[PDB]
Amino acid sequence: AVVSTDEYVTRTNIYYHAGSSRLLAVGHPYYAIKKQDSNKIAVPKVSGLQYRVFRVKLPDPNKFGFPDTSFYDPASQRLVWACTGVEVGRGQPLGVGISGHPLLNKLDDTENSNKYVGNSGTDNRECISMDYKQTQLCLIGCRPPIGEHWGKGTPSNANQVKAGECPPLELLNTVLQDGDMVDTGFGAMDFTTLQANKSDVPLDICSSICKYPDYLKMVSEPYGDMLFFYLRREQMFVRHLFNRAGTVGETVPADLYIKGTTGTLPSTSYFPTPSGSMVTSDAQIFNKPYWLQRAQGHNNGICWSNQLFVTVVDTTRSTNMSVCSAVSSSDSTYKNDNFKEYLRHGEEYDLQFIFQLCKITLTADVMTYIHSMNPSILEDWNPLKNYTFWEVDLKEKFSADLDQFPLGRKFLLQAGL
Amino acid sequence: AVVSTDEYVTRTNIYYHAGSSRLLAVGHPYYAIKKQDSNKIAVPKVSGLQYRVFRVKLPDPNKFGFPDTSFYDPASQRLVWACTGVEVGRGQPLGVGISGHPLLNKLDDTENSNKYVGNSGTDNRECISMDYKQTQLCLIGCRPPIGEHWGKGTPSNANQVKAGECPPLELLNTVLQDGDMVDTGFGAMDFTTLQANKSDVPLDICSSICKYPDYLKMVSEPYGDMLFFYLRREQMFVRHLFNRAGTVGETVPADLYIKGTTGTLPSTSYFPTPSGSMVTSDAQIFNKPYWLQRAQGHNNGICWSNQLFVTVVDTTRSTNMSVCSAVSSSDSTYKNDNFKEYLRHGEEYDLQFIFQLCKITLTADVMTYIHSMNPSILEDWNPLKNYTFWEVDLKEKFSADLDQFPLGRKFLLQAGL
Amino acid sequence: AVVSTDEYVTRTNIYYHAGSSRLLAVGHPYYAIKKQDSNKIAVPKVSGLQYRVFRVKLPDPNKFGFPDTSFYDPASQRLVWACTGVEVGRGQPLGVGISGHPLLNKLDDTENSNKYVGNSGTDNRECISMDYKQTQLCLIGCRPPIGEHWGKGTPSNANQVKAGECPPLELLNTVLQDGDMVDTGFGAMDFTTLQANKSDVPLDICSSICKYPDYLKMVSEPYGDMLFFYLRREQMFVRHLFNRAGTVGETVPADLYIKGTTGTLPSTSYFPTPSGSMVTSDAQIFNKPYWLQRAQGHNNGICWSNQLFVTVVDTTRSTNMSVCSAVSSSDSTYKNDNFKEYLRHGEEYDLQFIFQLCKITLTADVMTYIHSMNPSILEDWNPLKNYTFWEVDLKEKFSADLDQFPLGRKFLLQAGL
Amino acid sequence: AVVSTDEYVTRTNIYYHAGSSRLLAVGHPYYAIKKQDSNKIAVPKVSGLQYRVFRVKLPDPNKFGFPDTSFYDPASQRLVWACTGVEVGRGQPLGVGISGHPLLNKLDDTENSNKYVGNSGTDNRECISMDYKQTQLCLIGCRPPIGEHWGKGTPSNANQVKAGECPPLELLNTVLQDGDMVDTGFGAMDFTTLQANKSDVPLDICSSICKYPDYLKMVSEPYGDMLFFYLRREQMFVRHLFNRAGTVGETVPADLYIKGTTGTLPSTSYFPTPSGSMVTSDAQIFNKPYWLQRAQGHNNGICWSNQLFVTVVDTTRSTNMSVCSAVSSSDSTYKNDNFKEYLRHGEEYDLQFIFQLCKITLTADVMTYIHSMNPSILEDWNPLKNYTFWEVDLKEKFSADLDQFPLGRKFLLQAGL
């Protein structure tokens, strides 16, 4: 049986502040801009519709020296940082982005259509932009949290799912890594593999994967390292109702309608346009301090391995500024050829923390337990090379003067004495 | 005279955790996709607008063997599981659905008509989609809940209701089965029998009955096994205003308007489109622990016949993702013929429960009482073949370690000691 | 190590009221109207989208003589005024502004395009208005607060960013000055330098810098002078969805879409129209009394150098009234020629304060600490020439009879005794 | 120095109820309908957009005779009524108006312009109607309250503001009189003198003054008789965005835009159409009892000169019913000629009160005080002939049987004993 870190981890009156400097990110909000020839990234893809998985590296309390550590034996005892308070600073003004696609697959507007026009042509795709669902999360664990998304599954011992057929979907687990896409209104799937025409979702999501955090799994993990704090805030509505183009795969059962003279049965592949509606200072989940006093799972903000993952999505600040640059300010009349528009979005974060020094006495039982949990714990006391995270090193940003910082100042106060 | 189960069921300090594994369901949102020849279902009809009637099977405490059961005589006593808490965990992103009908019956948009064009021709139907009323409901009871819808009644000893005439309506009661439709803004009725043209409601309902919980009935049942807890959160508004095509049954009394020259009097058969407006985290009725400490009726969450019904409707997460497949990825110019769009909707559920062991002493009085109430309960201590339920067996999912689980861990806490 | 003024500034029972007469301001909301030949401002640009940085000049309490100052030695001690409560009276009726541009750079409406028309021509700009993002703020500090915005950045030791190219951005800090524009929903940036065509945002901002208070920097400053108090309320949504005109600088990766025959790929330079939705006396942040009992930073509203800054933005009273004057009223038929339309906007402030007398004992340690904090504080007890602020002098507006003023009256109540 | 009435006004245990009979008003909502020839008003102007200034007369307590006035000396003392509870009953259903102008000055809709048509003709005005900003107020002063609007100022010593120019504005204080217009989302101004074309506002305001309570002045008045209790509930948003017609006085500085070939530069005089949004029972500020237990200013609901002023504006019930009257019911075909549409609105108020009988001993000190306050107070104990109030006489409406009236029932109950 799995048991609470309070059963094997002693706390200590020692607290330290730690804050990341200002973290900025700027680039194009749709696709990346790589060199004209090389395939090396020039200007990243920084959208407001992107996860932020921060891997927060903490100094090893065992290297560090401590004064209140005089009734502590480094022979048989060890040290972890237990996270006590988190503040995820956000800067930039609130506002909304808006993604589109030069050739969106949209047939007609089936909200209040004018009439019925004969069978269409080939390529009825049109340029259309829209504003996605608004989300605001913040998961804190000492393992990176996972995501779920719908992806293409492998068929059974039967027929061959030849081209054009509908491939069986499969609900896949995945690790959330910096720069992944959140669901925008089209659900959480994998667009590249479930949509061949690559045309019916704006460019920012069309060739990628909108992931949704596996809350139900993460929450149900025995040890519960993947997250021991969260906050969700999603909300959306139907701006528009449309028809898709191209031949319907599963045709309509004729005993559901009466045969209407004249017609090859209009499209039924309907799809709506979301809308995040409105972003308001008061809706905001960020910029406030969170005290994870008691954790949701067994692990009680114990940052094994001296690490921390702060995951964050946030579409309230999503605005894309456009920059226009002229070919030559030598003209005196407006001509479009003379200017080039670019699109730029820039993200701004600030992470603060306050951790508590804790001690673990390595006895027969505890060692066993830690062992079945995670061996590295023990092993490192004497891996994710495949995942990409926004790296945050606070090995040199630790303080003990809580007073010098807003979050510390709060903490002192809020913790009372 | 009906009596509270506190009068004849003894409670004990024994609480077990029960949980279902991830339930998933993936199907077309509007209609089922059966094999091309066969009439066996290949892909189901999973939609956001459906009920979820879980039949929760529980292990029979009488077979199970227990330690605190020492001051318990199995000769004279029996055992029932009392439900103490429920938690309906809901996977996937909140999103919204959109339903439509290729040949919908929509004469013209009477919100702000342009003019008055003379008597139209035949078949002026059209492709029109729209977002249904938003609803979120959950009923827990140890018997299946009943619903009410408007159906076709049988006429009195008088004239023959020949074709064309309006049949009289009748309020019917019916049990809620997994898969039925909730009222979508069109009322709760039976569209197959009450609408011949099968063309004035999107297909997902036009050939179906839209039930609505009979809360008035179920509330009033003398035993109250039907439901001992429930929460409803329904809301909608008028998206558009239309006119129906087809001659009007009941003509307009001429003393209601002045004879306007030029006309056969335009249609006055009006219908509105609903819109459930917005879904949001805070609206959410699920993912939180319920504790049915005291039950609404007499039965205080005693699951007779080791059984439980969790009826659940949820239009918050009703997004249908479309998957486009290509006939041949050999072409390099977009052509609709080369693509097949498909609609799919995946549901994800999690059921969690906490049960109390309760003993009953089969005496002279109790037995006669339980007999009149339900005989089965007695006979079974020494049916629904016609109703279809999502089947959930937790016989092997019971645990006495409440600690290992969020709903249990909560339990323990909240209960106090 | 910085230390709370509570550590070196004694408080006395001495409270004065002070406040500014009616503060009006009236001009054109879009641009300043200077003489026809001279470059001398005739009518200012008073807009509801502007910053209000008030410099409050306070009487120096060392020249003043006091009666309760008999256990005070002016030889070794000095005096500062400590802010206790502010109150920012707003006049005019709630209302909302509207900003356009005769030659807005607005290709087409991509929200639900009709079709696809071939490649346009040159100059497709058109007149367009709109209601900006809605904001309410108010920073109280003893130094002028700072702003953050996106500017043009100097490139590195490499290639020459020739015309055409997209300049690297750089986030700049800057002093908020009366008259600056807040972000309007086009982000916080320098439109003069970052947008050449000077045609893709209303005139009230296309040639200015919209700034956004760097809460994050100020909050974090070690002494906390820049603000010891603040309230934001900003809210906004996407009224429209547009396409820009002109060539695209970062061209769409061809591997993200399928070569649709017939096109030079439509604009992908999308931009949205904000809207600040709706203003409600409920929303009001203003017209109340603020009591800075405990400061956010180290400075507990020590108005060092007998100064105060109240920075304020307010879009909820943002109306521009329009005045129509005739060329001759001798006509009896309407002709546009004969009427001249003007736009005019007027702001009305009222500034209320309540100060507590404080005494500092100039010792060894105290002096050196004040010195490395700010030397001027010591020097002056025996600079912003480049900054423009709405001067507010209250030297002659101090009152000891707090009962005569609402704020006065409240303060006594609220403080209790 | 001013001082609280508590300082010279003694209270007694004497309360008295009062109430005006049902107050009605019916007429035209836009303009007064005088006799055809005469200039006498036949149907007055009753709009939901108007201020309701009541002058509540009151019995002089000194001529009244009292039984508990046995330890009171009519030779040296005197009597005033102190208001204690005000109940502003409102009848009719909630509902909303819509003002219009057949030749409103509306060039084109610049929210989302079609194209760019060249230089328009002359008189492009059109019929437009609209709902105004929603406001709900109620001020209770023993003097009439003041209001503020943007008037036409006199120029200084220099040039002559010839016809065409824009007049310099000037903030004016005016007394609020029954029948005035509340701002309607075009701000507080004087449409007659500031808008020569008298065509760019619906008629109900186009030739009048819309005023806004000078809350800032009133509140700040040393005595505060103007008002001792108030509640405001104003809201509104932008239903559309338009463009005005007629030459632009203050032309756009050319360096704010690039020279667009093909243009005299479209209009840039923009104006928005407000929208009060929604009226709801809960929003309601009326139909509840108000207990001015403590006043805001110095005057504590003391009705000097036996007088009272209830200023109310309410747009929540602003429905205008239309009545159609035929020229001859002898026709059998609908013909517009045969009918006359008319417009009417009617207003239903009910004023209830509760006054407390206070005595004032006329001493040397108190006399000189009262005199400096208001000589009439003293001279009347042994003027607004130019202002127009809804006169309300309660001289005969006083009862001391508080029990007989809801208000009074409430008072007993609320005040406890």
Swiss-Prot record, chains A, B, C, D:
Protein keywords: Capsid protein, Disulfide bond, Host nucleus, Host-virus interaction, Late protein, T=7 icosahedral capsid protein, Viral attachment to host cell, Viral penetration into host cytoplasm, Virion, Virus endocytosis by host, Virus entry into host cell
One Pfam family this sequence matches: Late_protein_L1
Record SUPFAM superfamilies: Group I dsDNA viruses
A GO term for molecular function: structural molecule activity
GO CC annotations on file: host cell nucleus; T=7 icosahedral viral capsid
Top-rank taxon, per record: Viruses
GO biological process, one term: endocytosis involved in viral entry into host cell
Subcellular location field: Virion; Host nucleus
InterPro entries the record matches: Capsid_L1_Papillomavir, Capsid_L1_sf_Papillomavir, dsDNA_vir_gr_I_capsid
Subunit annotation: Self-assembles into homopentamers. The capsid has an icosahedral symmetry and consists of 72 capsomers, with each capsomer being a pentamer of L1. Interacts with the minor capsid protein L2; this interaction is necessary for viral genome encapsidation. Interacts with protein E2; this interaction enhances E2-dependent replication and transcription activation.
HAMAP family according to UniProt: PPV_L1
Family assignment from sequence similarity: Belongs to the papillomaviridae L1 protein family.
Function: Forms an icosahedral capsid with a T=7 symmetry and a 50 nm diameter. The capsid is composed of 72 pentamers linked to each other by disulfide bonds and associated with L2 proteins. Binds to heparan sulfate proteoglycans on cell surface of basal layer keratinocytes to provide initial virion attachment. This binding mediates a conformational change in the virus capsid that facilitates efficient infection. The virion enters the host cell via endocytosis. During virus trafficking, L1 protein dissociates from the viral DNA and the genomic DNA is released to the host nucleus.
Name of the protein in question: Major capsid protein L1
Gene that this sequence comes from: L1
